[PDB]
Structure 1
Amino acid sequence: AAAAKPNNLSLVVHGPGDLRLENYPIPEPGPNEVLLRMHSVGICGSDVHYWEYGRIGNFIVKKPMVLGHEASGTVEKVGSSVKHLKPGDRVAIEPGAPRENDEFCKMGRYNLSPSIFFCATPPDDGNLCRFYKHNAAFCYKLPDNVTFEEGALIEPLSVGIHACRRGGVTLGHKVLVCGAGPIGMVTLLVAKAMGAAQVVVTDLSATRLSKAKEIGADLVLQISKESPQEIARKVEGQLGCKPEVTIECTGAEASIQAGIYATRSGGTLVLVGLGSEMTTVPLLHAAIREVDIKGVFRYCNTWPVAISMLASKSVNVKPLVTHRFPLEKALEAFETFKKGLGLKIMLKCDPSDQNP
């Protein structure tokens, strides 16, 4: 009998509350794709939400979908046209890969390309499996002094990088970050790395705020039942001034209103968190003080920069990982996520290496 073939066990969502571990064919890379032996994949609210509700807004799982989109792996095989990667290369995978070179791509904002492929966003299958193929241009080699988990953390870190860029965060800025979830945390890390003089972080959880303090938050504010205006007042009282940039990472209407009231005139309020379709806010207040309201849709051109920051030890995201499980314990990992006691949970897909 022939030698046993490799397997491609994958974590799949079939519908609400229907999560399964099942085998998939081994992908074959096209001329400009590479086949990756998946190593580390972090999970986030998006994956868990698809599992629980089978959808996220207009994004609905109409057919079984493989989850996972924050990952790194090892190049197993390369397509006939791939030149910058070779078997054995450790790489970080940027999940959003444009299908066509449209005007958004040409202008440098490929994240807005309407037909972009994106891991784990229906109908595009994610990378929480053994073997995964991806456009080679969006697989970035990791330096030897950067771990697989760091490579996987580049995905959430990139949201923070993109958010701070969109907000214009720069040297000496006083920045308000609403929310101490993993997104608010990476935003904090990026803001400090970009030279923000003071970063104030808010959240409903004292626990998450204490963690924020641990990694650099200069000031923290636990939100209980204060009004948006009161929050803005407390933030300003703590900073001794109004923050030039507010990065909203909760998606909560009250927080958005607070961001509008708190941001300095001529400043920028970046909306990262996703809330409901409609939001009632004091637009007049923001518009009249020229406080710009800029949204964020994932990211663009952040992987090389993230890798440079990690390789130079300019930022430390390792503290973000609070738990790791092998791919096979995905269900246990998802249930753990729901407990909401951690931050970032890593899934280890390569049986030959379960290390960071």
Structure 2
Amino acid sequence: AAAAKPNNLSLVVHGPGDLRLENYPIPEPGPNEVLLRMHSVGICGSDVHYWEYGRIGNFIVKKPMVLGHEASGTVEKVGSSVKHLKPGDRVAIEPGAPRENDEFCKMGRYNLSPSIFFCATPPDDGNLCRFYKHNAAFCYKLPDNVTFEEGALIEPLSVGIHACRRGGVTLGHKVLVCGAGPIGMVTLLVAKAMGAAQVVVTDLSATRLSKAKEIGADLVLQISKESPQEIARKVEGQLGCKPEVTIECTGAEASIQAGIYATRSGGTLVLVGLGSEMTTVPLLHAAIREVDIKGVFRYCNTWPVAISMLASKSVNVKPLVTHRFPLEKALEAFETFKKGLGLKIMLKCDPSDQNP
């Protein structure tokens, strides 16, 4: 008989609480695509949320969907039109690839393209599996001194890069980060790398703040039941001034309100967290002091920069990885994520190499 064919075991969400490991066909790359032997894939709240509620806002799972969107792997095969990538190349994968060159792509903000393909956001299948095909322009070669897990960490790191950019974070800035979860952490890492003089991070958990301290947070503030004004007051009390930029990573109404009150006049409040459809905020306060309120939707043009920072050892994201499981233990990985302990959980999809 013929030799055994390769498999494409995949982690699939069928509905709320219905997670399964099942085999999928092996993708065939189009002329401008590459087939990747998946290596490392980190998971975040969006994967867990789809698993728990089968949806996130209007993005709802209407049919079985493969999870995973923060990954790296090895090029297995390339399409006829691919020139910059060859079999064997280690690459980082940017999950958002435009389907059409609309005005948003031409102006340089492809992340806003309405018909964009995005891994693990229904109805687009993610990459928590063995073999995955992706647009070649959105697969970036990893330098030899950058690990697969670092390559996978580029996705969450890019959320922080995009956020700091939109906020205008720069040399000597005093930056406030609301939330010490993984989003706030990468945001902290980026702010410092961009030259922020002081970064103050707030959170409900003293443990998370302790970890924030470990990776660079200049100041931490544990929040309990203080009002938004009191929070802003305490923040300013610690800095000796008002932060020029605030990056809200919790999505909670009270925190958003605190950011408006805390941010220096002419500064920027970036909203990265996702909360309710409606939020009650002191717009009048913001307008009078020209505190801009800018939202963030994923990212654009961050991979090459993230790779340069990692290759030059300008940032250290490794401490963010707290657990790693082989793809086959995906369910245990998700149950672990739910326990709220840790920061970034990594899934190892390549049986031939389970290392970082």
**1:20 Cα deviation (Å)?**
0.2
State the distance in 2 between where 1:125 and 1:101 align. Answer: 22
CA deviation profile, 1:211-232 (whole Å, cap 9, x unmatched)? 0000000000010110100000
**1:177 Cα deviation (Å)?**
0.3
State the distance in 2 between where 1:207 and 1:78 align. Answer: 46
1:118 aligns with 2:85: no
**1:28 Cα deviation (Å)?**
0.2
State the distance in 2 between where 1:41 and 1:128 align. Answer: 7
Aligned position for 1:68: 68
**1:287 Cα deviation (Å)?**
1.1
**1:91 Cα deviation (Å)?**
0.2
**1:32 Cα deviation (Å)?**
0.2
State the distance in 2 between where 1:313 and 1:68 align. Answer: 26
CA deviation profile, 1:244-264 (whole Å, cap 9, x unmatched)? 000000000000000000000
State the distance in 2 between where 1:41 and 1:56 align. Answer: 20
CA deviation profile, 1:292-337 (whole Å, cap 9, x unmatched)? 0000000000000000000000000000000000000000000000
TM-score (norm. length: structure 2): 1.00
**1:63 Cα deviation (Å)?**
0.3
CA deviation profile, 1:143-192 (whole Å, cap 9, x unmatched)? 00000000000000000000000000000000000000111000000000
CA deviation profile, 1:71-94 (whole Å, cap 9, x unmatched)? 000000000000000000000000
1:298 aligns with 2:298: yes
Aligned position for 1:266: 266
Aligned position for 1:341: 341
State the distance in 2 between where 1:226 and 1:136 align. Answer: 49
State the distance in 2 between where 1:72 and 1:95 align. Answer: 10
**1:208 Cα deviation (Å)?**
0.5
State the distance in 2 between where 1:235 and 1:260 align. Answer: 12
Equivalent residues in 2 for 1:145-224 (5 A)? 145-224=145-224
State the distance in 1 between where 2:68 and 2:210 align. Answer: 28
Give SS of 1:220's match: strand
State the distance in 1 between where 2:151 and 2:31 align. Answer: 24
State the distance in 2 between where 1:19 and 1:229 align. Answer: 43
State the distance in 1 between where 2:76 and 2:201 align. Answer: 42
Give SS of 2:40's match: strand
Give SS of 1:233's match: helix
State the distance in 2 between where 1:253 and 1:72 align. Answer: 35
CA deviation profile, 1:24-83 (whole Å, cap 9, x unmatched)? 000000000000000000000000000000000000000000000000000000000000
Give SS of 1:169's match: coil
**1:121 Cα deviation (Å)?**
0.1
RMSD over equivalenced CA pairs, Å: 0.3
State the distance in 2 between where 1:250 and 1:148 align. Answer: 28
1:15 aligns with 2:15: yes
Give SS of 1:341's match: coil
State the distance in 1 between where 2:51 and 2:340 align. Answer: 16
Give SS of 1:199's match: strand
State the distance in 2 between where 1:181 and 1:9 align. Answer: 30
**1:288 Cα deviation (Å)?**
1.1
CA deviation profile, 1:128-155 (whole Å, cap 9, x unmatched)? 0000000000000000000000000000
State the distance in 2 between where 1:287 and 1:347 align. Answer: 45
State the distance in 2 between where 1:288 and 1:4 align. Answer: 69
**1:200 Cα deviation (Å)?**
0.2
State the distance in 2 between where 1:274 and 1:175 align. Answer: 20
State the distance in 2 between where 1:7 and 1:205 align. Answer: 42
State the distance in 1 between where 2:202 and 2:60 align. Answer: 31
CA deviation profile, 1:225-284 (whole Å, cap 9, x unmatched)? 101000000000000000000000000000000000000000000000000000000011
Gaps of 5+ in 1: none
Give SS of 1:22's match: strand
State the distance in 2 between where 1:137 and 1:143 align. Answer: 17
**1:111 Cα deviation (Å)?**
0.1
State the distance in 2 between where 1:171 and 1:279 align. Answer: 32
State the distance in 1 between where 2:283 and 2:126 align. Answer: 37
